[PDB]
Design a binder for this molecule. Structure first.
Ligand SMILES: *[C@H](C)[C@H]1/C(=C/c2[nH]c(/C=C3N=C(/C=C4\NC(=O)C(CC)=C4C)C(C)=C\3CCC(=O)O)c(CCC(=O)O)c2C)NC(=O)[C@@H]1C
Lengths: 172, 162, 162, 172, 162, 172, 162, 172, 162, 172, 162, 172
């Protein structure tokens, strides 16, 4: 996979050139924003279980047909599978946040997932709703002003939303 | 590509776990060491041409036959000399990538993988490049942890050639 | 045992390689984060008894039936109460070990492995311990990165119980 | 495996006790000596190839019967094997230096090696001589006063010698 | 799905053999035990509503806090109560399927697989269901081998929850 | 796989309902017919070898081009393969008879067989003829009035023919 | 050894589970079928000598050359005849074991495993034994389910030889 | 493995003889006692969890040093392992009850267990105490006069105790 | 197909190597032995009909019952006799292929693979073919190394049938 | 695979016939030409490294864009892969020369290679140029009149060119 | 060790078969090629000293720096020169072993395995040995198939170094 | 493994010397005796089945207790195993004859066989008798004067007997 650093290096190598001043400056800024990035990852990770559980309850309360006999989330085996998937997607999203690049998400998670859900008979659009709910919960937790050194950490919040939307679009 | 971050993620993904404090500390170590690494990368990049020109000549001086002996593997022709300077520039560029990435990944992927096969197939002597790298290490003009950073990757290349 | 150092070594040993700068940066991150971790460990250790006593009672208050219901799994007898305070002290002690070690290894090895089987076999409710851990998180009285360190492992325990 | 930190934790757990002030103080000192430790590991690692090569040449110049037809290091396959072993031992020794504990050395390297050499017919005492030569080279490189911030970094040099002697005794 | 018949076939198919007398005797045992199983299945089905209603209340009586404590995992609201009665009906329905199928397959596939993960994720206590199952076992009003059949699967569920 | 019992259970579960009286009655009848079913399985199984051998001889006598040099059944390796397939199909058919459901046949045998024969160059229609011959032999053996307690056991004979025709259609 | 009981246990042990009702029904089928099996076993045992003597001669009658052709594989000498009667007694004894055990295990272990290799190495024709087994099936004088039991194993032997 | 039936067959085969009348009579009796045997297996199996749990609590209340920091049952991983072993032994004992022969117990469970516990550092004599407690609980459950057709089912209870004592002696 | 050449290539390809002198010597051995092999192949081909006719009758003489006994597996009818002569011609043709190819490959692929299954399924006795092959070996009229070549494959067939 | 001998045998078997005189005569001639064939294989094999190296240098001198940053042969890993492929193709071509049949080439090398190069992004037409260069070098080495018993060995040279062209067309 | 015979045996043993004509022809090829191989082996052995002395000097002439440059890897000292002549004698001796054995086995086992690692670790240039081997090939004074044999292994060594 | 050629080479290498004239002469003689060696291997191999079968019949006629109920060769599975072993030993003996060295026999067959038979309960001395019978049959077949070019081929017969005795001593 590639983080935001190896991304620039791989682009430079393909052209056979040393890095330019603009590129060095851009990279130094990512480093200066590292504290905020680590805070967001730690906060989302620390609330992993509640984020998934609360999103699952909300999904099933809005779409009760998913847990009614026959529904795709009926039976404990299918329910467990569905909870596992929500946790897995959340996991890969945090990886992408730490890396500052979405390749690890696309490569080991999103790629081929839509096809997987169609083969199974799993409603991708419902998965997308679950992902969206986790997004709003993850962002409200990561960007919570309480208990942390004040500062603008909003550009990062847009980057984080991007990854969630990215995953929601891959299954939808 | 091997970096402190991709190593953190791979390790977590292999255990199918969420990143832990263990992994996040590692990344913080990477962010803090960046200051000295970026310092070494910029300096090597700014003085790239002279380090390469000086490195090439140090090789020709250490191994005088590389300029007189006949054979396409030697720098005894204008093309050979161009090939040699190109190769040396490749090594230097790789080292700035390692500094910028915070790991050996770039060098491992673009240069070290398949290195022995190439030097063997085209009859290129490893001791030639080792001498070029020793020149760069002695003349990059870096001090403190910036030098420690540059030297770490230079020596990584040298050991790969040994 | 999982620590920033053993992870560095394992990763290098798996590739049969010598430690690289990539691994050494990680360890430096570990040494620098130690200041805040050791701060949290000492504080929790000094106030261990009151945190445990306060944590036990918060559980009895949240789940009043644990003090009245009959059954060896409940704290409705002197022994049950002793078992409960012992368990809570176990969780706290584990957290100081994680802080001191710089990773979840201690907690993973001594407490989390086999956790579900135990709570299932002895009919102990996970929500009981989660409440004890929430009490400790709210009352350890740590600030800054020392609190961030303590909270990280407290929440790691909570998620393991969820 | 265990580093110097997990070593204290495992001892405390076996007794079921929180760490004492003396123990916290001892651990903080290891942390304060971390820079020196990282310098020693980086320096030895950076000179890995020469340390092994120079020790091999010295060994074979003193014990020529090892490379004479029949000798245990005769033929390129056996010579390669012997060089690999010297590199492997050096590798595990640096791991132990970084960990501040010798368990990784004993566990994944030294344990069962003597038996391995006897079964093969490899002279353990000659291996011990090679190890000793690397020791003197590794220490002179790690403790070289040139190009580094001045300071007493000698207790660490005794710790390093200890690991080498530890390996030399396991094969001898 | 695990039944005396599919087990007979799977065992034969794994050895790539034709069914033998060994397998056919097993099936005959299944056909002969059916009389008592179908007897237990019909009876539980006919009295389903009262067993479920009685079972739900036995749980609320054994664990009074499930009706007063706040939290979506509790039966302290109309929805919680509806969820609880639904779950209990699920357990009972599963048991009639096992009786009818002659094996634990239905329960294994539709309920036991993923059971721990669910009770853990939604914070549902296993001791709640065990009490519901104990009520059903004590009040199904079956005798002879019909009771032995019903009890066998009821206890299978209980052990799965233990 | 599913037997006739798990088939009804799976249908009921999908609807989330207890079994109805009609369903209980239908299931009790299958149980009452179990003796006849076991007799048919035992009788066909007991004559497995002759059924396959006699059908093979008949096929090759009618379609001699299958064993002429070049033919798909020429050479002992191909002949053996062809006999194995006839035995395999007969085997899965008896499984389906015992289960009272054809899923085990479709799932582990018939599914993907047609594609398999086309890739090989094996004439599916000739396989179908072999299957048909085994059918007539299997049924005449299973429904033989000699040496068994008299009674109408003809509905079962139609069920058995169904499975054979099912396999013959999957390769044809 | 393959029996209804060892199959029940093996199946449970492979899933690392306790025996279930599914397995216990199978065993009950085995106990109930025993009455007819023990009936067939005793009868074959009581009439062993005449069945063997009659079976041997049926073979000599069907294949007249086995008594005249020269070669140790033939029954053209007193030893050959003794070997043949011994072999036939082996088949019969195996069948009483299968009846008593409730499965093909005895026959599978003591006779069928390695059967082709033996008949091939010593040039013994399978059609010889098949004829002996057909004689036993036609003359054991059993009726009802006792005959069904005996025939099942006799035909199992015949198919193994085919 | 061998059940009580294959045991007699294997003894007869080794001697090359048909079964004697005494042997047939002995075997018929085992069959006549089959109902009692199945009841004992079903009853013990049905109470598997409580038997193990109650025996574990009793053991740890009598031998508290096993769960004190350092003890062999300290930490959840070791506690889980210990509970697993008790369940495993109980499992193999029920197999032996059903088979009417102890070979499956000796072969797949007891054989080599003592050596296993010594290598680990697990107190075999304490394991033996746990086994003994399960024995008394298993027998009181199996031989409970309530809810079952009255009759002497005591010889079987001695056979069952035998297996438990057999396992207790193999670890002790 | 197994030949001295394909064996040479397979061995080299398995080691992912270029053919060596080791492999090329083997092939030269194959080319030099060809003279005697081609000699045996042509001779057997020229006298094919009489060897087959003579071989068939030797079988009928050794095993007189194959011409009188009823059953499709016997040569007691015009069809049986045609089948038998066809089979014998198959064996002979296979042997000329082995001689021409320089190895057992043809016989292994077209005749020996599945041989036991066929003789077992159609009740064909191996001793019948062995006698046909012994006749061919005794009457092919070859001498020197040509006979050694023919005999080698004839005996290979015989052993495959044993 | 098939050599020129097994090729004729397989054709005869498919028709169920002994070999004809014409066929025997044709086969004897291949045998008489065996010396020349072995010389060509030995000579090409003996110069394996130079053939590949010289062809690689020539290719890269004509098509420099293949080794420029980004090019498909840029970086040592890709360069090594490209040299390996040239050696592999040369290897399988010599196998075909020895066998006198091209099946081993098509089967284990050429088949599916074009698809492999397209998936990777490797220019097949450039591979074809490399193959062509090896062809001219291999043939000039094999058919070199120096140091060998004089004679017409040209039909074999056309056969050899055929294999090379065969491989060049499979990637082009 | 790889020889025409051990290859024949290994191939047969891998298929668990008896040696066939296919394998025996290969060995005959080996025995017939021996005449030329033994001829080349004896000749190289008789002229060993002069070939080695001449080969060493050809290297010093092609690469003049190997006699003047400082460094233990060079032949610029009496010891270096002794090491070089020893190495060259090793290559020659290996080639006589290959000729005598009929395969590359000796060279593969005693010299080629680990060859790259050695030249890399001790900084010995492969082109040095290739030149020594080219000298031996040009001056061994063998003709006919004896030369073809010697050259085959000489070129095998050269390719191993390339 | 080693043949008679690699045996001399390995001895010379261990001493670091070229081969001496005596050694070259000795090796040339082995080559001159190659025809006889190939004849012996071909003849024994051609009669593989009868050699094994006749030796088995003879063994069982002399030692009938081996096939009596209980005997180690009783039951077809054990009989088959015993015949397989005789064939296996004969196979490895022919390998040794072809190689002119017994290492392949010792290494892949004889080594550890005695221990194998003791663990099983197989009478090694009876195996030795079977081996001896094959020896006398193999030698009478290999050294049969009929149908072969006359000549002294007796030294080879002593070498062959040596291998058989070697195997007989390893199991005895
Ligand atoms: C064609 C490429 C060129 C050519 C070939 C040519 N070769 C020979 C004869 C021989 N070649 C060999 C070589 C080998 N035999 C082997 O078993 C092996 C593998 C170990 C090799 C490499 C041999 C032994 C001979 C025969 C003896 C001899 O040297 O003559 C011939 C002559 C064939 C004949 O005798 O009628 C020819 C024509 N000649 C050319 O000019 C081409 C460039």
């Amino acid at each position: 996979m590639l983080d935001a650093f190896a991304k620039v290096v791989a682009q430079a190598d393909a052209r056979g050139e040393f890095l330019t001043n603009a590129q060095f400056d851009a990279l130094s800024n990512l480093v200066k924003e590292g504290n905020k990035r680590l805070d967001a990852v730690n906060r989302i990770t620390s609330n992993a279980s509640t984020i998934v559980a609360n999103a699952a309850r909300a999904l099933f309360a809005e779409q009760p047909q998913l847990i009614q006999p026959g529904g795709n989330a009926y039976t404990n085996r299918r329910m467990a599978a569905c909870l596992r998937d929500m946790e897995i997607i959340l996991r890969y999203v945090t990886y992408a946040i730490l890396a500052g690049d979405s390749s690890v998400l696309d490569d080991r998670c999103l790629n081929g997932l839509r096809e997987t859900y169609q083969a199974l008979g799993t409603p991708g659009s419902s998965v997308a709703v679950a992902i969206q709910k986790m997004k709003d919960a993850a962002i409200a937790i990561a960007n919570d002003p309480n208990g942390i050194t004040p500062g603008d950490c909003s550009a990062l919040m847009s980057e984080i939303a991007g990854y969630f939307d990215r995953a929601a679009a891959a299954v939808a | 590509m091997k970096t402190p971050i991709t190593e953190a993620i791979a390790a977590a993904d292999t255990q199918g776990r969420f990143l832990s404090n263990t992994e996040l500390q590692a990344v913080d170590g990477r962010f803090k060491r960046a200051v000295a690494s970026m310092e070494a990368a910029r300096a090597l990049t700014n003085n790239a041409q002279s380090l390469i020109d000086g490195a090439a000549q140090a090789v020709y001086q250490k191994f005088p036959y590389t300029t007189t002996m006949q054979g396409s593997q030697y720098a005894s022709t204008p093309e050979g000399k161009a090939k040699c300077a190109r190769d040396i520039g490749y090594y230097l560029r790789m080292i700035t990538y390692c500094l910028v990435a915070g790991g050996t990944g770039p060098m491992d992927e673009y240069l070290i993988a398949g290195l022995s096969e190439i030097n063997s197939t085209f009859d290129l002597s490893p001791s030639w490049y080792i001498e070029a790298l020793k020149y760069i290490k002695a003349n990059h003009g870096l001090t403190g942890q910036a030098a420690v950073e540059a030297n770490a990757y230079i020596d990584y290349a040298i050991n790969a050639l040994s």
